Design a protein around this nucleic acid. Structure first.
Ligand SMILES: [Mg+2]
Ligand SMILES: [Mg+2]
Ligand SMILES: [Mg+2]
Ligand SMILES: [Mg+2]
Ligand SMILES: [Zn+2]
Ligand SMILES: [Zn+2]
Lengths: 117, 908, 69, 106
RNA sequence: CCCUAUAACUUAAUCU
RNA sequence: AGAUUAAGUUAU
């Protein structure tokens, strides 16, 4: 069958494309796009200036203190408050658990989820 | 000593003699030279000048030299007139003309030069040889790039085993940038004074000061023409290796000031590229288009993309990639890509953009789902500190950590093999090929090997000649566009890439689209750029090293149109026997023998040579990949227009050269390299291989002392080779034919992807007339940014032994019937490891899949013709095990050795 | 001898894989490091030291019973 | 599953190395490590001991024969996480079960 | 979840 | 002898 499955993949692509603009909120995207001269921006600045969530993948403790020290940090000219930290097994790590001595007991890399302030 | 105080002059410099007495010193320096008696960029010996080194107040020696030239008297008057015309230019080294009693002979003293010229730095880096690099070490220690004990570290020069050498070479960068600015000032002085002449690199200091006015001719002022083609073109690899324009990324062009903060929304940069070209390359007379969509042919694309790769190192990395618009489809907001900003090709805008549509057909659903705009705009922001590569977005909330499991042990074959006597201590055949397992950090660690890909500028005049010689190697084939009902897709049950692998394999999208929808999508890509997403997967295979392999599956929207563009030419390449590119030639039925007899063809004093490409998929520059796709698309001269051919090139660069790469549920930016699952990757690697070999022969011939070439024909060939590279801008098709015939006579190549075997003339290579291994090391150093060690190369004197290694096979010359043929045989541990370790638990059955061992015994047949008895017992072990499985299952030919001897005899 | 210890490290990592060591990242990293270093060894003493250290992961969890086998 | 465990211990019996045989025989009698047996004298070794006959079969005094290696005992903890001294334990003190031993390589 | 592209070869089952 | 389908093997 080349039309039953064709309508099926058409419906699936419709579902996936209409799910995606429900994820984004157009409050920041329109003032990004209308600030452009010809309404045309790079893609690489869309999740940098619009996304409400940041994931930081950190391989070892020395990068963690130089990047995400404290419960808020600064990246991409924004301030982000840390919502969660999970490990390579995706187990929740407390922020009080990431220490210089406690670092071999953790399963590196750590994934720090932060929200835009 | 009375000659010394006249040389000292009024400058009040404390001078010691670098030579002895009043005699002329003898140095050994690199000169770019073009007479009617010699041509080339070679090291000669200069017996022309007396040198005097300058001491300081604490009599430590300075890098100031007083270089006093003895010559004839007409040259003295001529250079005095030219200097008096150009004495107020600050790019000119200060001169002092006098006459002395050596009998009266005239002397031209040039004051406060450096020890080395710019030609010595350019020769040091473009003819690099470790163990014979003294000028490079003296230049690096002199100008404070590193200390002298930096080189006591072994492999200090290696770009891969020591990536700190890029920081050292980048400390020569402001030196080279000041040299460029002084060349523009000297060219402006020559144009205002009315002076014509060729600017050569050996007449310019590392300080940047110019001299040697002995070939300059005066004309009317305002009408000076400086010839700067060989200058900039020979300088061009140093500009990216030393990163000379990094000061242009700072405020007011000052390395002490901060970085320029650009707009994030800015992507265009055409006026900034035009200003950079006006500042550093003002007298380069070929027109430069910052956006390569305005180019006139493919040589214009190469020429202008070579300036764009240099100027794109100044601009912010977030400005490159898919350019994105907001589109209302079905009254609904939507995000699509309407262009691309390429580092190499400038800004490309899509032509068929629809700002408003009510519904979406199946074609535009495919184009919008392949687009990384909707996936990146809907994802989270990602900051991945594991890798250096640029990170775009996290498509989900988790990071995927895929591992590789170990192999499955077939114990029955292993104890059958130790039953026959294999695997003893001190035996010649061991186990070295295993399924190495990997942990969850292996995919990103293999993605981090794209850090070997650096933005590399090419010698564009050399490259534009080499592309015509390389295109001569592809004249026999037939190419062009085909329709969608003429394509042949072999394995339809393979992955369709991201995001199409969520819904089916490639069978689904080749069945769901019409032929007319496929033709419409192909017609769409000749006018618009579709960026796609390449998915990285870890390969579960057997190997000798524990390095994890990744494959790069390309999405179906790219593969479907690239088959339609390239498949005619690729099927024509793969169906040709007796050619240089031997893709498609079988090794069975006498095919290996015919390939080796074709490569041996009529070379006079034949030696075999074979080299290595370290990190070939990762470290391949973008200019050579664009060059390879242009060489492939030179078959589309009738079906395709110029604009269609440009949009197909831009789709190849936006799809498999600098695409966005999904690696564990996260988009990253690929710097460059080859995608492994491109439609045309083996053939583009063959083009790249022939390109580097032709460049090696050009660099061998041009760096040879033309006074020492005893053949008159080879000497005139070297003269016209220099003329066709640097002194001529049309294509000289007679000389391309002549040089291609010279290469086919003395440098015979057998190329399959990166792998190659040349049969070369030994007397010509010892004289430096065809390339040798050192030439390949040099060419891969400055073009490919890798150090190819000679431990991974091989040469071969005896042609009755075959090549040492080609396509993992060794060669034996054995008596077959009444002839002597060349048979290929593999490493016996590779066949034994394929027997012992498998990847599926149902291949451990043995009684199921006898076919597996039949194929392995087909591969291990010529081991029976080997002198090693332990090598020859591998085929008999496979025969006896095939017989054992075939008997305890329940066609007797599978343990008769005649079925397998039939596979290596010419009667197909 | 060395072929035997390489082959049984292949079997040992395969049974540690199907026992879900891969659910712990910090353990599976050391297991694949020991497995890859056994398969690359040139002298059998190094191989047997790493083989002992890899078998300790199997015996260190109670999912096996050494009496039955 | 069980076929691969069976063939694994079949080829483990064939190797006939004394360290592997020591570890394998120890695991049947309840002498099982708590972590990875290390190849450095720095890292700590955590071995459970299930009874006193296994205790004097495994160690005598302060030194400890395990994995065909010598390890001086540094620390001993009984099941209720009370730090037990080396001179504290004997067969009369053994009812007073299984206890962990922390050692370092000699 | 996930396993690319190209080329060669073997076996089996079908249609001429 | 040619083609189609499926399984497998090698190379890059
Ligand atoms: Mg000169
Ligand atoms: Mg001169
Ligand atoms: Mg290689
Ligand atoms: Mg190779
Ligand atoms: Zn152009
Ligand atoms: Zn075409």
């Amino acid at each position: 069958r080349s039309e039953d499955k064709r309508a099926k993949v058409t419906s699936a692509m419709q579902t996936m494309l209409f799910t995606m603009l429900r994820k984004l909120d157009n409050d920041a995207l329109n003032n990004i796009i209308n600030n452009a001269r010809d309404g045309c921006v790079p893609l690489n600045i869309i999740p940098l200036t619009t996304a409400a969530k940041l994931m930081v993948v950190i391989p070892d403790y020395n990068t963690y203190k130089n990047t995400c020290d404290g419960t808020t940090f600064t990246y991409a000219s924004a301030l982000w408050e840390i919502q969660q930290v999970v490990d390579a097994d995706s187990k929740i790590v407390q922020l009080s658990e990431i220490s210089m001595d406690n670092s071999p007991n953790l399963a590196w890399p750590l994934i720090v989820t932060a929200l835009r302030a | 000593q009375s000659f010394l105080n006249r040389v000292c002059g009024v400058s009040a410099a404390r001078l010691t003699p670098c030579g002895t007495g009043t005699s002329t010193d003898v140095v050994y320096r690199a000169f770019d030279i073009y007479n009617d008696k010699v041509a080339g960029f070679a090291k000669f010996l200069k017996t022309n000048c007396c040198r005097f080194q300058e001491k300081d107040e604490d009599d430590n020696l300075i890098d100031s030299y007083f270089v006093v030239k003895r010559h004839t008297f007409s040259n003295y008057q001529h250079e005095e007139t030219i200097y008096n015309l150009l004495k107020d230019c600050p790019a000119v080294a200060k001169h002092d003309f006098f006459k002395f009693r050596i009998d009266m002979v005239p002397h031209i003293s040039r004051q406060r030069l450096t020890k080395y010229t710019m030609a010595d730095l350019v020769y040091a880096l473009r003819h690099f040889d470790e163990g014979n690099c003294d000028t490079l070490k003296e230049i690096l220690v002199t100008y404070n790039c590193c200390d002298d004990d930096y080189f006591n570290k072994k492999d200090w020069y290696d770009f891969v085993e020591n990536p700190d050498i890029l920081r050292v070479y980048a400390n020569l960068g402001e030196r080279v940038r000041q040299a460029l600015l002084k060349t523009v000032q000297f060219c402006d002085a020559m144009r205002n004074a009315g002076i014509v002449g060729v600017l050569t690199l050996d007449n310019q200091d590392l300080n940047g000061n110019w001299y040697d006015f002995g070939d300059f001719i005066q004309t009317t002022p305002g009408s000076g023409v400086p010839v700067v083609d060989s200058y900039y073109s020979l300088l061009m690899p140093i500009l990216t290796l030393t990163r000379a324009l990094t000061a242009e990324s700072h405020v007011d062009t000052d390395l002490t000031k901060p970085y320029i903060k650009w707009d994030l929304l800015k992507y265009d940069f055409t006026e900034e590229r035009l200003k950079l070209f006006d500042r550093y390359f003002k007298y380069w007379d070929q027109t430069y288009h910052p956006n390569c969509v305005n180019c006139l042919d493919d040589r214009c694309i190469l020429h202008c993309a070579n300036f764009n790769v240099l100027f794109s190192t100044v601009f912010p990395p977030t400005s490159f990639g898919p350019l994105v618009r907001k589109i209302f489809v079905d009254g609904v907001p939507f995000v699509v890509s309407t262009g691309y900003h390429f580092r190499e090709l400038g800004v490309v805008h899509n032509q068929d953009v629809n700002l408003h549509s009510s519904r979406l057909s199946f074609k535009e659903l495919l184009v919008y789902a392949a687009d990384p705009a909707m996936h990146a705009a809907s994802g989270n922001l990602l900051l991945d500190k594991r890798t250096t590569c640029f990170s775009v977005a996290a498509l989900t909330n988790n990071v995927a950590f895929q591992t590789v499991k170990p192999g499955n042990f077939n114990k029955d074959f292993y104890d059958f093999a130790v039953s026959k006597g294999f695997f003893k201590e001190g035996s010649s055949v061991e186990l070295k090929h295993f399924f190495f397992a990997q942990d969850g950090n292996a995919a990103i660690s293999d993605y981090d090997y794209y850090r070997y890909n650096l933005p590399t500028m090419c010698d564009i005049r050399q490259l534009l000649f080499v592309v015509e010689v390389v295109d001569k190697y592809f004249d026999c084939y037939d190419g062009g566009c085909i329709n969608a009902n003429q394509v042949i897709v072999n394995n339809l049950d393979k992955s369709a890439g991201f995001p199409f692998n969520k819904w089916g394999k490639a069978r689904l999208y080749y069945d769901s689209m019409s032929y007319e929808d496929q033709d419409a999508l192909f017609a769409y890509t000749k006018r618009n750029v579709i960026p796609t997403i390449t998915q990285m997967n870890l390969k579960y295979a057997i190997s000798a090293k524990n390095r994890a392999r990744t494959v790069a599956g390309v999405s179906i929207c790219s593969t479907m149109t690239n088959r339609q563009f390239h498949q005619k030419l690729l099927k024509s390449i793969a169906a040709t026997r007796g050619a240089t590119v031997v893709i498609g030639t079988s090794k069975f039925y006498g095919g290996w023998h015919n390939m080796l007899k074709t490569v041996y063809s009529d070379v006079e004093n034949p030696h075999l040579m074979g080299w290595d490409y370290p990190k070939c998929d990762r470290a391949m520059p973008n200019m050579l990949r664009i060059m390879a796709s242009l060489v492939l698309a030179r078959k589309h001269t009738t079906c395709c227009s110029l604009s269609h051919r440009f949009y197909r090139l831009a789709n190849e660069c936006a799809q498999v050269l600098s695409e966005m790469v999904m690696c564990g549920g996260s988009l990253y930016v690929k710097p460059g390299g080859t995608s492994s699952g491109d439609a045309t990757t083996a053939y583009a690697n063959s083009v790249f291989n022939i390109c580097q070999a032709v460049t090696a022969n050009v660099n061998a011939l041009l760096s040879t002392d033309g006074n020492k070439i005893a053949d008159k024909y080879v000497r005139n060939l070297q003269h016209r080779l220099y003329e066709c590279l640097y002194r001529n801008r049309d294509v000289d098709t007679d000389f391309v034919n002549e040089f291609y015939a010279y290469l086919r006579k003395h440098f015979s190549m057998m190329i399959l992807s990166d792998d190659a075997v040349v049969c070369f003339n030994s007397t010509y290579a010892s004289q430096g007339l065809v390339a040798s291994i050192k030439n390949f090391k040099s060419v891969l150093y400055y073009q490919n940014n890798v150090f190819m060690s000679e431990a991974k190369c091989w040469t071969e004197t005896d042609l009755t032994k075959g090549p040492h290694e080609f396509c993992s096979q060794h060669t034996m010359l054995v008596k077959q019937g009444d002839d002597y043929v060349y048979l290929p045989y593999p490493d016996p541990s590779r066949i034994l490891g394929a027997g012992c370790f498998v990847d599926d638990i149902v291949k451990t059955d043995g009684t199921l899949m006898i076919e597996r061992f039949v194929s392995l015994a087909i591969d291990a047949y010529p081991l029976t013709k080997h002198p090693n008895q332990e090598y020859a017992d591998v085929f008999h072990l496979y025969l006896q095990y095939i017989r054992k499985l075939h008997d305890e299952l329940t066609t007797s030919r599978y343990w008769e050795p005649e079925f397998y001897e039939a596979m290596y005899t010419p009667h197909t | 001898k060395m072929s035997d210890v390489k082959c049984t490290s292949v079997v040992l990592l395969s049974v540690l894989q199907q026992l879900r060591v891969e659910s712990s990242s910090k353990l599976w990293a050391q297991c694949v490091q020991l497995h890859n270093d056994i398969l690359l060894a040139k002298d059998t003493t190094e191989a047997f030291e790493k083989m002992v250290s890899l078998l300790s992961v199997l015996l260190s969890m109670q999912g096996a019973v050494d009496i039955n086998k």
